[PDB]
Amino acid sequence: AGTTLTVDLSTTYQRIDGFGTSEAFQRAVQMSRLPEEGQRRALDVLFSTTNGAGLSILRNGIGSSPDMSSDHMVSIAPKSPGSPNNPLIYSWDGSDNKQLWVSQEAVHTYGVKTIYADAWSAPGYMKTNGNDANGGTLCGLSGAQCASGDWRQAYADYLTKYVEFYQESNVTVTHLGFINAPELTTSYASMRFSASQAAEFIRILYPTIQKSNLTYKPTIACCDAEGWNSQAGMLGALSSVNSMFGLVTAHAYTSQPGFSMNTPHPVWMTEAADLQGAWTSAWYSYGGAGEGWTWANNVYNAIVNGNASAYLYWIGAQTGNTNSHMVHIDANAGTVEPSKRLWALGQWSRFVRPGARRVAVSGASGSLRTAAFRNEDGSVAVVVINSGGDAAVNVRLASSSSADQQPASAKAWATDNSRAIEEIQASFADGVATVNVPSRSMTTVVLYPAAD
Numbered sequence: 130a131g132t133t134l135t136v137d138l139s140t141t142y143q144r145i146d147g148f149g150t151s152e153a154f155q156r157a158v159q160m161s162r163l164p165e166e167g168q169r170r171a172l173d174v175l176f177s178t179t180n181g182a183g184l185s186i187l188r189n190g191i192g193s194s195p196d197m198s199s200d201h202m203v204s205i206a207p208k209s210p211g212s213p214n215n216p217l218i219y220s221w222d223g224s225d226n227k228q229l230w231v232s233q234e235a236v237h238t239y240g241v242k243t244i245y246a247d248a249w250s251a252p253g254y255m256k257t258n259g260n261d262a263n264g265g266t267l268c269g270l271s272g273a274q275c276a277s278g279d280w281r282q283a284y285a286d287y288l289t290k291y292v293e294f295y296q297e298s299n300v301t302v303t304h305l306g307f308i309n310a311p312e313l314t315t316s317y318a319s320m321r322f323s324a325s326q327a328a329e330f331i332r333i334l335y336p337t338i339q340k341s342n343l344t345y346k347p348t349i350a351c352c353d354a355e356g357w358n359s360q361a362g363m364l365g366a367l368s369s370v371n372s373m374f375g376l377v378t379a380h381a382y383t384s385q386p387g388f389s390m391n392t393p394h395p396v397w398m399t400e401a402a403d404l405q406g407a408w409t410s411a412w413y414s415y416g417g418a419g420e421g422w423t424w425a426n427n428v429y430n431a432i433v434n435g436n437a438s439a440y441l442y443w444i445g446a447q448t449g450n451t452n453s454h455m456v457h458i459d460a461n462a463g464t465v466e467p468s469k470r471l472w473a474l475g476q477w478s479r480f481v482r483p484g485a486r487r488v489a490v491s492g493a494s495g496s497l498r499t500a501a502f503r504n505e506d507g508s509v510a511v512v513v514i515n516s517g518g519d520a521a522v523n524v525r526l527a528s529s530s531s532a533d534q535q536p537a538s539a540k541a542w543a544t545d546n547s548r549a550i551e552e553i554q555a556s557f558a559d560g561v562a563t564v565n566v567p568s569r570s571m572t573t574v575v576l577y578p579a580a581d
């Protein structure tokens with residue numbers, strides 16, 4: 130009588146903080162160059178819960194560079210004060226590489242409440258190599274002594290000031306990172322920390338945040354390693370400072386998020402993309418690296434197998450013809466073109482809202498991959514990734530709690546080769562939703578308590 134998926138609300142796993150992306154390295158500046166119509170279409174496809182992906186997290190870069198040449202993110206303190214005991218020279222431009230505008234829109238127009246500010250590097254004058262690019266380490270960490278002096282507290286004060294500048298512009302930074310890919314030396318903003326050096330810095334940053342006049346004390350994150358395997362390798366050294374930070378972060382480049390890390394903290398997958406793959410907007414062709422289907426399955430893997438509480442693609446909107454970004458902007462034409470990778474992330478984010486709890490679901494046939502989430506508002510979202518033909522599915526709840534009320538209505542949306550989070554029939558009868566899950570799709574079925 131169709132396949133029945135039964136949600137067990139009494140078996141719970143990780144909280145979901147949400148889904149998102151970045152506009153770092155002046156990708157936000159590229160959005161700002163669009164006509165007003167195009168700016169709003171780019172902001173809608175990213176953040177709109179009615180006509181967009183409903184992304185619920187924005188990752189901002191804490192600019193390290195002396196200026197905005199090339200795609201560099203200028204620092205709030207680009208000029209050296211000479212000694213780390215001298216006051217830092219802040220030169221706040223009220224733009225932050227156009228990330229403040231994107232943030233203000235995300236928060237005030239679209240209701241986003243999670244903002245993750247992550248430094249790729251300290252300013253060059255705070256580092257062993259005197260540059261924010263080409264690796265090097267923060268002056269004054271163990272094994273990183275500098276003629277210029279110990280810049281560790283100055284770096285903590287600087288990160289705190291950046292958060293303060295966002296606060297005074299009506300945006301709360303909720304999460305704060307001080308490194309990115311700390312195993313990697315690159316030709317752009319980059320900075321090398323060992324796990325011990327990360328733990329040493331957290332000892333200094335934590336009391337700096339805790340003692341500050343910040344209205345909201347942001348959660349310290351570590352360490353945006355390039356994969357699960359590399360980040361897992363840092364957790365031993367980090368365990369001595371588990372009382373001093375509250376978020377573990379890693380990318381999906383050098384390994385996949387396929388296992389639960391041994392950490393007490395929530396874990397986010399903060400960066401993945403097909404960075405160099407030829408642009409495609411396709412949902413499904415053959416399961417290649419850029420296809421919407423592939424990315425819908427990557428998010429599934431990170432949440433169900435990696436115990437991720439969040440999933441961020443690298444870039445939202447950007448110019449150029451690789452899959453590093455979800456949304457193509459043609460600066461000439463003033464056009465915005467979402468790939469089916471944007472719709473893949475949205476097929477999660479629209480229905481699995483911040484503060485959702487992952488809950489057990491059973492009944493899936495071999496062609497179906499399923500997961501279920503109970504939202505803070507009591508709505509229950511059930512993900513079905515269908516690798517087979519169309520599949521008639523029934524969705525129902527069970528609980529061991531008599532406080533859990535039966536749902537009063539259901540709706541369903543699908544993304545596939547012809548649909549972008551398009552509503553499909555959800556035939557509801559006495560607590561059960563019946564849906565025809567399209568061939569080669571990700572479908573989400575949501576059961577709603579009565580608003581009336």
Ligand SMILES: CO[C@H]1[C@H](O)[C@@H](O)[C@@H](O[C@H]2[C@H](O[C@@H]3CO[C@@H](O)[C@H](O)[C@H]3O)OC[C@@H](O)[C@@H]2O)O[C@@H]1C(=O)O
Pocket residue numbers: 154200309310317355400404405449451453454
């Ligand atoms: C087609 O060039 C693309 C690059 O090949 C690709 O790596 C990316 O380059 C960005 C760079 O992205 C980093 C990817 O590695 C991560 O560890 C790191 O966090 C990211 O920052 O970021 C710096 C920026 O200057 C490069 O452009 O995207 C390139 C693109 O043009 O899309």
